[PDB]
């Protein structure tokens, strides 16, 4: 019976791998930025063709102005504001860490100490995917502040257009 | 004993899950900037708006 | 190559579909991020269930 | 207990990871916010609804 315990194939692994979630990144580069006119990437190429039409401003310049201002505020508190939770989170994370070390004091059996690694494994697992994410919210900051700058020039070159036509009149 | 103390199930895994660390981070991040007026992250959304109250010169 | 207005129309192009590319492949990033917790959390789920010792290894 | 150790103190290293990126990202808000604050106080010096001037006495 213990021989068949520890000798054998068990299945786990082909245990939730058919999720592709290797789709949710680019497959190549070289065409990642030929994405929004078709091809490169899909998934992203609605997602840029929704933006690109939502950046664009809309109504009289002053309204474009006060839109510009807001966003830029909104975008600097909101930078500070999702540091600052996150690093809560983390300070939490650091006390969940060193519970699951309190408890590796009290394993007993083999299997315990066991279950206990692949605890540890899964939380470190956790802490890879706060990582990813944080890459990515500093990636969406990046992108985010490009696109108040492309709505300034925007707004810049809607002002300076040489496509004008109207002059004040003298009466 | 030994083979009791090889197989069986000890409840480790199950053990401090309840703790809910996702919610420290953006749920999705469409509405991230669109937190401060309301929706979007409401963590962040009351901070948001005691930073802009404080950063008024 | 072209014009100077072709180039600067180029040019224009260029910047906002950077800007646009980049929100976009960090929000499909973040989507597929989300998803791999759950992941994770499923494989925690079948920790609490393992029996032998080869199971768990 | 030893292999189970180092793994937490692996953890703990993943935390610190995460803590200095979100340090990054609070000074990289800190410095907007200061920007924000200069512009602010320009926009202030140079507002159009100031009606005052010197005068000729």
């Known amino acids: 019976r213990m021989y068949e315990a520890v000798t054998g194939g068990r299945g786990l692994g082909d245990l939730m791998r058919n999720a592709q979630l290797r789709e949710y990144l680019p497959d190549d580069l070289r065409t990642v930025y030929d994405s929004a006119n078709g091809g490169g990437y899909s998934g992203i190429s609605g997602s840029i063709n929704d933006i690109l039409r939502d950046e664009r401003l809309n109504g009289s310049v002053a309204d474009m102005r006060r839109s510009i201002e807001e966003r830029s505020r909104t975008a600097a508190a909101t930078d500070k504001a999702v540091g600052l939770r996150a690093y809560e989170g983390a300070q939490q994370r650091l006390a969940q860490i060193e519970g699951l070390m309190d408890e590796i004091s009290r394993t007993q059996d083999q299997k315990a ?59």
């Open 113 to 171: 100490i066991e279950e206990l690694q692949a605890r540890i494994a899964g939380e470190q697992a956790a802490i890879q995917n706060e990582t990813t994410k944080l890459q990515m919210i500093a990636q969406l900051r990046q992108a985010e502040q490009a696109l108040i700058s492309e709505q300034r020039r925007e707004r810049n070159m809607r002002i300076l257009s040489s496509g004008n036509q109207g002059m004040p009149t003298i009466q």
